[PDB]
Amino acid sequence: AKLVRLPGLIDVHVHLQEPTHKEDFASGTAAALAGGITMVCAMPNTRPPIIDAPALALAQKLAEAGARCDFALFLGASSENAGTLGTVAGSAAGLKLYLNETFSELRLDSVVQWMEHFETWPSHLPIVAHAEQQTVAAVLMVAQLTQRSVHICHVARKEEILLIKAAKARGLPVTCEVAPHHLFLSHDDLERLGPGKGEVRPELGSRQDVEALWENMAVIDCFASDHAPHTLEEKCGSRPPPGFPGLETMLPLLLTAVSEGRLSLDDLLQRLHHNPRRIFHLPPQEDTYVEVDLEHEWTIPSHMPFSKAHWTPFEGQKVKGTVRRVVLRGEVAYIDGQVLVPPGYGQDVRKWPQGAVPQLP
Amino acid sequence: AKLVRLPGLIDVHVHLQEPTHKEDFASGTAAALAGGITMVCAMPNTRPPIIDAPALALAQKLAEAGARCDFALFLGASSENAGTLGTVAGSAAGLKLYLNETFSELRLDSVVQWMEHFETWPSHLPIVAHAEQQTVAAVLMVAQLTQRSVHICHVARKEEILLIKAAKARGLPVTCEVAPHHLFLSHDDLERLGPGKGEVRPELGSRQDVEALWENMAVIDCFASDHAPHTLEEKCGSRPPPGFPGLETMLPLLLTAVSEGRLSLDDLLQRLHHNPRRIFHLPPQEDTYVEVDLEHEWTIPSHMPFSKAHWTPFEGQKVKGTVRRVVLRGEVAYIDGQVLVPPGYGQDVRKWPQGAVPQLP
Ligand SMILES: [Zn+2]
Ligand SMILES: [Zn+2]
Ligand SMILES: [Zn+2]
Ligand SMILES: [Zn+2]
Ligand SMILES: [Zn+2]
Ligand SMILES: [Zn+2]
């Protein structure tokens, strides 16, 4: 009882797998709304990947038709599309670089290819990098050589957060995000999950990694789920893909941390609302808010109701806090386990006049 | 030609002197709109000062009746009101502490009085401090002892920005603002202005102070004019009050710096839009934007048309950039030297449902 009104929360790192069995825009944005999230940024490592104008055009129409909450779509860097995205770049959330193991169309085989993208992508638009361990230092070098900013995805190690800390003390334009599974899970949990389910990139860290992220909360600009819904069949199979589902558990876990005094409510809103807004130039959502009950104690079940992943690595954890109601642009979108907006209610925020990134003419 | 669309800019530090000859809400917010500013935070050192509930109630009605753009009103800390503002605190922009020379009702005569305010002001609401030189270090200590954040007004010296830099490297929750006269004026200009006009608190810095602020732009969270309109009669008189008018010159000066590559357009928008939003929890303004012409060269005249100060210390400086049009909540508010919204069109953003600061119940 006694609900708290939050602004519409933003998750800047989700995999909705459309262009489907793992998840689609309709089911993924339903999981988002149930987690208090009213706007998401979808990553480009789909099949086909979003690495050129026709693929983005297709993805945009599928999301406009399936999305239940508002969204923006990332473009993906490839070994061949550097210098070809200028005309559509402004319509995307930003450019995503996969600098570690991917074995996909987004594989870059040389740091020179990184520079070509930093040099050709419009300088006023966001660039985001999946960069682990020393790769974070390498991409920061490229960002400095090209005299522009970069945003580092899912920081998970003491090594990574301390380097970002050192870069920020030197005044370099770097921001970063951390995912809930790197704040609330560690190696102490791999025994329970197993090597199939516990497969994620970046991998789970040690207790020292987790403690370092919490100790350096001041260095973390954003929280983002890295929603990577894979079915249990794939996570437990021979070659299990990496990633966890997390849209529905992100806010409950972090509200639990707030109730325990680990971070303040403001700390949470900076990292799930204000900083995502200003890093990716995402527009406000009028008449949009989330109502949470901070008193409700519950246990995370074997699977959350909406994500098609049908499993969660936070099973059994005790949480304090739940989303009671979500209103999106004047309409009740979610209430106590039911989503009440149809697929297609969501819109591409980059098409809004206030959602375009300002630039010099 | 070729205009750029900016979001509604926010100035979190203005003196509008109502509850009038120096300036009132009507003329001050006109100067604001002509400077591309659609929302202002007014300081409490008026006559009477805003240091209790009846004074705030009065000021709120005067602003609602005179303001041409949206606003929030600061409460002022005094030697007697600690622990008495709890019921109205949420209706104010924040709490303003004057820790240096003021000889007014806002004079605090002991650091213990600072702590009492940090201890009694609601922990989720903003506290802002006028703190110069070592006072910045002292108020940071108080903020640490009371385990909360603080925002430092108009940083003007190498000494101050380096200490804030060191505090942020230690992870302390401190943010700060800088005013245009401390980025574009120095001791080299006091010869022209004289000791009467050149009187400002914080005083103008050396060239080394100015260079240090620019070199440490990464440490500056906000730009704010510290609009302190005093008539030429007072600035040139026996005991001249401190402060400059700056609402109408802030954006042109900073756009000049952008055109010269001293900072990026994004750097500007972070410090005049996004960061003011998230530090003071100010709501968005729907259907609001500013159109600027970045090509227009002009010279700052002896006085700008709207501010009742009728003088400016930037006289003669060559600038590149001008505000062509301002739209505030769906109405043309300003166009090429004419304000087209009447006194009273502006609203108190703290009364908006989205303008209240979220708190734990
Ligand atoms: Zn739609
Ligand atoms: Zn990744
Ligand atoms: Zn990812
Ligand atoms: Zn009004
Ligand atoms: Zn001051
Ligand atoms: Zn002031």
UniProtKB/Swiss-Prot annotation, chains A, B:
Chain spans, region DHOase (dihydroorotase): 2-328
Positions contributing to Zn(2+) 1 binding: 13, 15, 96, 226
PTM annotation: Activated by MAP kinase (Erk1/2) phosphorylation just prior to the S phase of the cell cycle, when the demand for pyrimidine nucleotides is greatest, and down-regulated as the cells emerge from S phase by protein kinase A (PKA) phosphorylation.
Domain of life from the UniProt record: Eukaryota
Impact reported for residue 130 to N: No catalytic activity
Effect of residue 226 to N: Abolishes dihydroorotase activity
Residue sites binding Zn(2+) 3 per the record: 96, 130, 154
Induction cue: Transcriptionally repressed following hypoxia by HIF1A.
Binding site for Zn(2+) 2: 13, 153, 177
Residues bearing PTM N6-carboxylysine: 96
Phenotype when changing residue 182 to N: 11.5% of wild-type catalytic activity
Family: In the N-terminal section; belongs to the CarA family.
Disease (UniProt): Developmental and epileptic encephalopathy 50: A form of epileptic encephalopathy, a heterogeneous group of severe early-onset epilepsies characterized by refractory seizures, neurodevelopmental impairment, and poor prognosis. Development is normal prior to seizure onset, after which cognitive and motor delays become apparent. DEE50 is an autosomal recessive, progressive disease with onset in infancy and favorable response to treatment with oral uridine.
Quaternary structure annotation from Swiss-Prot or TrEMBL: Homohexamer. Interacts with CIPC.
Further remarks about this protein from its record: GATase (glutamine amidotransferase) and CPSase (carbamoyl phosphate synthase) form together the glutamine-dependent CPSase (GD-CPSase) (EC 6.3.5.5).
Purpose: Multifunctional protein that encodes the first 3 enzymatic activities of the de novo pyrimidine pathway: carbamoylphosphate synthetase (CPSase; EC 6.3.5.5), aspartate transcarbamylase (ATCase; EC 2.1.3.2) and dihydroorotase (DHOase; EC 3.5.2.3). The CPSase-function is accomplished in 2 steps, by a glutamine-dependent amidotransferase activity (GATase) that binds and cleaves glutamine to produce ammonia, followed by an ammonium-dependent carbamoyl phosphate synthetase, which reacts with the ammonia, hydrogencarbonate and ATP to form carbamoyl phosphate.
Name the UniProt record assigns to this protein: Multifunctional protein CAD
Lineage: Eukaryota, Metazoa, Chordata, Craniata, Vertebrata
Gene name per UniProt: CAD
Residues of the full protein shown: 1460 to 1821 of 2225
